[PDB]
Write a protein that binds this ligand. Structure first.
Ligand SMILES: CC(=O)N[C@@H]1[C@@H](O)[C@H](F)[C@@](OP(=O)(O)OC[C@H]2O[C@@H](n3ccc(N)nc3=O)[C@H](O)[C@@H]2O)(C(=O)O)O[C@H]1[C@H](O)[C@H](O)CO
Length: 376
């Protein structure tokens, strides 16, 4: 009997937690591990320390067929310890379930650990506000059972379906906001159902690691001393946080890049609507997937210090390097930021606005959408 651990995430936040799990378990050099993290490359000098370490690409939010070649290397009874993105959990587990069908006598699911993609889970839940949640949960359990028995996916409520894994497997959920599940009264049946199966993402995990494990983790997440030193300057600091669009259309991507530059100018220029003051040093923390939208900022702004886009904002919180003020387009990073550090959050009944309002992240003041800002 052998456990294999799979770490799967096409996004950022689940991967950040899963890389913490790997760090906590890093003394075990031979435990089989399969990494399917789209946004993170494990350094070669770390890979070389481990045996039975494997890598799999994700395509259309699932591990490719290459997963099967890896699993075939382990011919005995295997129990899978699976770490997944909540929003994409149904797709990410699909090929795992297909493999289990083919090898029903030797392959089992030990447990699931699930982590929020980010704001999407909350915006999606907010849209379920008028439904009978208790009834939705019962139907989703039934349809999950059909998926597990047939390998076919058909959910009447794809959103609620993300939360009924306990009906089939031992599970632990790690939520960006546990407050949401208490504050949203319509979700009371879901909070009750989830019972003892969830906790908040633990941003204090890093502080509990050993000095060696702390250094290891920082290497996993792309943090380096140069970035550290940039953020240790003796001057008040403002970090402008970027966003992205998933659209490929050039007109849309160009519009996003232009509007975001205009938004930056509204924070940093004396005549801007959101003017922060002249005494701040300005940094740019671009979206990990901003691409040429990030480039547009660096090419067109001045006196701005880049923080490499691949570095998740939450690492600054972990390392004690948060700035005085943070501002930009609504992002999951705002869910874990001390409220005193928010300058302004800008949006592109709006369900995202509703989520942030429920959580006390934004106040009762009229929300600012970026198309309401004068072109400076
Ligand atoms: C509603 C919806 O669709 N929310 C999804 C969200 O669940 C998903 F997870 C992600 O989350 P998103 O909120 O962009 O941010 C997720 C994480 O990325 C890192 N980050 C982001 C921006 C930045 N300037 N510096 C950073 O470091 C932080 O670790 C943060 O917590 C995502 O793909 O990661 O993208 C958003 C949006 O699709 C996207 O914002 C475009 O509107």
């Amino acid at each position: 009997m052998k456990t294999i651990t799979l770490y799967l995430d096409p996004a950022s936040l689940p991967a950040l937690n899963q890389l913490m799990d790997f760090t906590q378990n890093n003394e075990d050099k031979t435990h089989p591990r399969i990494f399917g993290l789209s946004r993170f490359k494990i350094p070669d000098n770390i890979i070389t320390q481990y045996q039975n370490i494997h890598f799999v690409e994700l395509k259309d939010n699932r591990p490719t067929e290459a997963l099967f070649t890896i699993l075939d290397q382990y011919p005995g009874n295997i129990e899978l310890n699976i770490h997944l993105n909540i929003a994409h959990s149904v797709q990410l587990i699909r090929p795992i379930l297909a493999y289990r069908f083919k090898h029903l006598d030797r392959v089992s699911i030990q447990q699931l650990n699930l982590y929020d993609d980010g704001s999407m889970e909350y915006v999606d839940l907010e849209k379920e506000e008028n439904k009978d949640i208790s009834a939705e949960i019962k139907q989703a359990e039934k349809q999950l059972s059909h998926y597990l028995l047939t390998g076919k996916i058909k959910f009447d409520n794809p959103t609620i379906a993300r939360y009924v894994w306990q009906s089939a497997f031992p599970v632990k959920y790690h939520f960006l906001s546990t407050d949401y599940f208490e504050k949203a009264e319509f979700l009371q049946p879901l909070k009750e159902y989830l019972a003892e199966n969830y906790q908040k993402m633990d941003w204090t995990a890093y502080q509990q690691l050993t000095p060696e494990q702390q250094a290891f983790y920082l290497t996993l997440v792309g943090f380096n001393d140069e970035v550290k030193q940039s953020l240790e300057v003796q001057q008040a600091k403002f970090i402008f946080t970027g966003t992205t669009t998933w659209e490929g259309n050039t007109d849309v991507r160009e519009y996003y890049a232009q509007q975001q530059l205009n938004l930056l100018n509204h924070f940093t220029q004396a005549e801007g609507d959101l003017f922060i003051g002249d005494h701040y040093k300005i940094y740019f923390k671009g979206h990990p997937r901003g691409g040429e939208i990030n480039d547009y900022i660096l090419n067109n702004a001045k006196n701005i210090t880049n923080i490499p886009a691949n570095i998740s904002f939450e690492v600054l919180m972990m390392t004690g390097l948060l700035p005085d003020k943070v501002g930009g387009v609504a992002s999951s990073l705002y869910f874990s930021l001390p409220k005193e550090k928010i300058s302004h959050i800008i949006f592109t009944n709006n369900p995202y606005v509703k989520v942030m309002r429920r959580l006390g992240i934004i106040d009762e003041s009229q929300v600012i959408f970026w198309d309401s800002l004068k072109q400076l």
